[PDB]
From a paper:
The protein crystals of the [name]‐[name] enzyme diffracted to 1.3‐Å resolution with R work/R free factor values of 14% and 17%. Two enzyme molecules were modeled in a unit cell with multiple residues adopting two conformations. The double conformation of the 127–130 backbone loop, harboring the mutation site, could be modeled in both chains, whereas loops containing the residues 213–216 and 86–91 could be modeled in two orientations only in one of the chains (respectively). The side chains of numerous other residues were also modeled in double conformations, including Ser70 and Tyr105. The comparison between the crystal structures of [name] wild‐type and [name]‐[name] revealed two differences in the active site. First, the substitution of Ile to Tyr at position 105 considerably widens access to the active site, due to the orientation of the Tyr side chain, which resembles the conformation found in the TEM‐1 enzyme (Strynadka et al., 1992). Second, in the place of the missing Ser130 side chain in [name] [name]‐[name], an acetate ion is present, suggesting possible anion‐assisted substrate hydrolysis. The overall configuration looks similar to that of the wild‐type, with the acetate molecule occupying the position of the missing Ser130 side chain and engaging in H‐bonding with Ser70, Lys73, and Lys234. Our kinetic data indicate that acetate ions could potentially also take over this role, as the 4‐fold increase in acetate concentration augmented [name]‐[name] activity by 64%. The enzyme either exhibits dynamic behavior on a faster timescale (ns−1) or the observed double conformations are present only in the crystals, for example, induced by the moderately low pH in the crystallization buffer (pH 4.5).
Author numbering: 27 to 57, 59 to 83, 86 to 145, 145A, 145B, 145C, 145D, 146 to 238, ...
Amino acid sequence: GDLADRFAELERRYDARLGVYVPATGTTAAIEYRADERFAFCSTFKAPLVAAVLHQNPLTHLDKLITYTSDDIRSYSPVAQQHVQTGMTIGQLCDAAIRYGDGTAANLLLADLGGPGGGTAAFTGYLRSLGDTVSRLDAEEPELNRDPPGDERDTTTPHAIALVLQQLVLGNALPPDKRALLTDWMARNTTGAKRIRAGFPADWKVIDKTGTGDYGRANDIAVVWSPTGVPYVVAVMSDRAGGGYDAEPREALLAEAATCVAGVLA
């Protein structure tokens, strides 16, 4: 009752909708708040996207050169903008997608996974293969960040995306080598310093992938480890849709939600 009341007060104070999921462990109950409501992925999908591309190919595929054109840049792409003439390798694209949320990098990874027409379906199908039957990606960048409130397109749920990230980082969806690549890129992003990371004490390890979008959308998905190595998965999702498409996202809402979780888990 206490935690639900705390999350409700966060919603009132930030004029926001908040979703939280933390899976159960052997000694802890699941934490859930709007955990089965749909929220836009925004860039959070880039973490399982990189997993999908790692999964389907040998490590040498990281060195495959991808060519692309200025026409492919229709989203914030601070890395891919600099390399149009030369192309980028798959590994470089993964790094860019995770560490900067480069949009074009994600689009090219989608096309590596499923071809130019089939990538969003292929990505969704990777989630299906991990037993996520809820989430859906229907558009690529930048449109996936812009669907109207209430539209199911390009959404996941805190519950669904937490269980996916759990399998990728704590489970064996990936072999150890590939899993370590994903976790290393996530451990090296910092877009997420002011989100879940800011709610956990410094002696807890945190790896994360953020997402930000229209309608004040701000998300973060993370795996955390206690100072003695005990892991938890934390998905926090939010929007401020009442302010319209240009509503300001509130990173501090996510930090506060994470602080609430950390207090329960400590």
